């Protein structure tokens, strides 16, 4: 009302997206008008197409870029600022958007022009990045069904449309299920063991639900299923009945009634298999592997190698917990269950290493963590990062915005950071997303390149009262992880937009720079630069750092097996499993767990209903990508170990090489080749095993 369609924020030229002025009401008109314009642009491209950059690749990027940026900003708002109105609007336009993506991807004039470039007599003279681009476009067109005759084509497109709808539904159900659970505790006794920080959070939560007399010390408390609330309960609640209840609630999220994801999963797997068959593959995992470094065989081999290396340690971890609980006179030591594991692990960790998480929190405040992280980035990669709040519109008052500068003081990139748990409207977990890519084609008139912009999103414990966000070590690692992704997007030296940043990096290599960054949390200079008391300003005592260092490999076997269980169940569901038979996804879960867990899952276990990585994310038949890339990240880190981590000259020289290979080259060179350029040789799994004490 009262504004023209032509003034819709989604239709404007912008440097930074209008995150402060876009809502549900803009989505239907904006997306539908945009799609009409992109249709006309595609028609013009197809009519004039030649196998050259100006006549094919440049006009293609302009179309792809506009849709990616605008849809990206809408989907980002869905992820961080969900509303019923925004859900409805996205649902309403999603089929039109998907129809256009299929139309574009299945363009025969575009595909034929790319094949002509591939078939050029001087192909070998084309730059590696441009060769990678052409090869990717050809492969992607076949994977989006371009080779199918019109009847099989129609079936393929119906499958794509339904999968898109189901993945959105899956994620909405997960958000809604996490949102729904509320445990009100009145009796002070039932919350025995919960530390001041958790009490302070549960009370702050109680205030927002009406209980205005609620304090941390005395007033009522609300327990929720988002991570910053859920974890402290499982770690610290002495009331075993409370642990079992909260555990069972977490484990059954989105698994019954209106929010049930079971049938959605069943349909997703059915459609994925139908898609695989249409494309001439045996199963969906083979489809997934087409764009990955791995094959089904090689992924399974790595998982089995890591599983074999982890099993004995995981068994010993279990025995250690039993022994410790028994030595405390704990009645449940004779019958330890899944709702005892986290609790007794924490008690064991406290006793064995003499470190208490609550006492560490004052040393890990977000502002100091960011300062230390930026200092590390300067040391390794030669970049200066500074606050730039006000330059770009944001969607929430807690969102930080930063400018990244090179050594000459020239901006090279920007990023947003949305750090705190906000379960009413914001997806759980942590992630990085692209905002705009580094691109020559999308540059402003006069300048050579559009600078890249990234999102980092975490869900860490929110600030309590007036104090800064005080963090756990895991939360620190999570920030370093997402920053690693942001760096690969931001520090890319490719100006070929379609292979810049993280684009066209085989999915099983994208977790390299992220997991790589996590290693530095244990690097003494880095940890000490971060760990300053938020009030006092005093540096973490040396003796405490040594305890943190000692605890690094605690339960590494168990942590490893847990990841391998996730990766193995993913692979199994997309290879051997056939939907529609008497066997359920939970039967698959039980079978795979025999070799990847020391005790069976509960029969009531419904973790699959919240496994968004594989049902509403990029990791379907691909969760193994974490461990695949962790071999790479650990080995990359071992180059610094070899060079001398106590030698700042060596650290900077090695950091520069990492900056100029892994962070610079995007998908413009095969990831194995990029890795070899950095490492000097092909990867070894020895560093990964050594770092985790599993040799």
């Amino acid at each position: 009302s009262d504004e023209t369609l032509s003034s819709n924020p989604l239709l404007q030229d912008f440097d930074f997206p209008p995150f402060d002025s876009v809502d549900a009401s803009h989505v239907r008109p904006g997306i539908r008008a945009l799609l009409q314009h992109l249709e006309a642009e595609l028609e013009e491209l197809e009519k004039s197409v030649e196998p050259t950059w100006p006549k094919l690749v440049e006009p293609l990027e302009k179309i792809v870029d506009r849709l990616t940026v605008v849809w990206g900003m809408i989907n980002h708002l869905k992820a961080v600022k969900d509303t019923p109105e925004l859900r409805a609007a996205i649902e309403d336009v999603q089929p039109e958007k998907v129809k256009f993506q299929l139309r574009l991807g299945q363009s025969k004039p575009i595909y034929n022009a790319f094949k002509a470039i591939r078939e050029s007599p001087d192909w070998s003279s084309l730059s590696e990045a441009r060769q990678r681009l052409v090869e990717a476009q050809i492969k992607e067109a076949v994977l989006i069904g371009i080779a199918l005759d019109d009847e099989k084509r129609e079936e393929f497109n119906k499958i794509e449309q339904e999968l898109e709808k189901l993945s959105h539904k899956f994620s909405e159900n997960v958000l809604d299920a996490t949102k729904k659970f509320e445990k009100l505790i009145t009796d002070k006794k039932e919350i025995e063991g919960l530390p001041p920080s958790a009490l302070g959070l549960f009370a702050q939560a109680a205030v927002s639900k009406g209980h205005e007399n609620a304090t941390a010390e005395n007033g009522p408390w609300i327990i929720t299923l988002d991570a910053p609330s859920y974890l402290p309960v499982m770690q610290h609640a002495k009331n075993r009945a409370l642990r079992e209840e909260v555990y069972r609630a977490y484990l059954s999220r989105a698994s019954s009634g209106d929010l049930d994801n079971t049938a959605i999963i069943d349909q997703i797997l059915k459609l994925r298999l139908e898609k695989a068959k249409l494309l001439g593959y045996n199963n969906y995992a083979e489809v997934s592997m087409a764009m990955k470094m791995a094959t089904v065989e090689k992924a399974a081999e790595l998982l089995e190698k890591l599983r074999s290396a982890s099993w004995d340690a995981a068994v010993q971890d279990m025995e250690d917990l039993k022994s410790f609980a028994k030595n405390q006179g704990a009645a449940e030591s004779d019958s330890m269950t899944h709702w005892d594991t986290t609790f007794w692990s924490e008690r064991l960790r406290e006793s064995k290493y003499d470190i208490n998480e609550e006492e560490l929190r004052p040393y890990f405040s977000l502002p100091k963590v960011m300062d230390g992280l930026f200092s590390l980035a300067k040391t390794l990669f030669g970049i200066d990062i500074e606050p730039a709040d006000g330059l770009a519109p944001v969607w929430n008052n807690d969102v930080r915005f930063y400018r990244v500068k090179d050594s000459s003081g020239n901006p090279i990139a920007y990023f947003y950071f949305d750090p705190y748990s906000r379960p009413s409207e914001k997806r759980g977990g942590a992630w990085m997303d692209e905002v705009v890519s580094r691109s020559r084609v999308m540059a402003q008139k006069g300048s050579s390149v559009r600078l890249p912009v990234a999102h980092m999103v975490c869900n860490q414990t929110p600030p309590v009262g007036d104090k800064p966000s005080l963090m756990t070590f895991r939360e620190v690692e999570t920030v370093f992880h997402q920053f690693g992704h942001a760096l690969q997007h931001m520090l890319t030296k490719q100006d070929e937009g379609l292979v810049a940043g993280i684009r066209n990096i085989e999915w099983d290599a994208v977790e390299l720079p992220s997991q790589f960054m996590e290693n530095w949390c244990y690097h003494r200079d880095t940890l000490m630069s971060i760990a300053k008391h938020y009030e006092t300003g005093e540096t973490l005592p040396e003796e405490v750092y040594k305890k943190l260092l000692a605890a690094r490999t605690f339960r590494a076997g168990s942590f490893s097996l847990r990841q391998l269980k996730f990766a193995s169940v993913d692979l199994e569901l997309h290879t051997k499993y056939v939907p529609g038979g008497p066997e359920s996804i939970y039967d698959v879960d039980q079978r795979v767990s025999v070799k990847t867990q020391v005790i069976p899952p509960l029969p009531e276990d419904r973790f699959l209903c919240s496994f968004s990585h594989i049902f509403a994310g990029g990791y379907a038949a691909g969760y193994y990508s974490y461990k695949w890339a962790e071999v790479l990240s650990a080995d990359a880190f071992s180059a610094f170990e070899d060079a001398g981590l106590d030698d700042i000259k060596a650290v900077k020289e090695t950091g520069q090489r990492f900056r100029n290979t892994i962070l610079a080259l995007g998908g413009g060179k095969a990831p194995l080749k990029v890795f070899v350029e950095f490492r000097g040789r092909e990867p070894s799994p020895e560093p990964l095993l050594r770092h985790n004490g599993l040799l």
């Binding site: 942590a430 992630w431 997303d433 999570t478 992880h481 994208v510 977790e511 992220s514 990029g618």
Partner: peptide
Amino acid sequence: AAAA
């Protein structure tokens, strides 16, 4: 999304 590059998750974690």
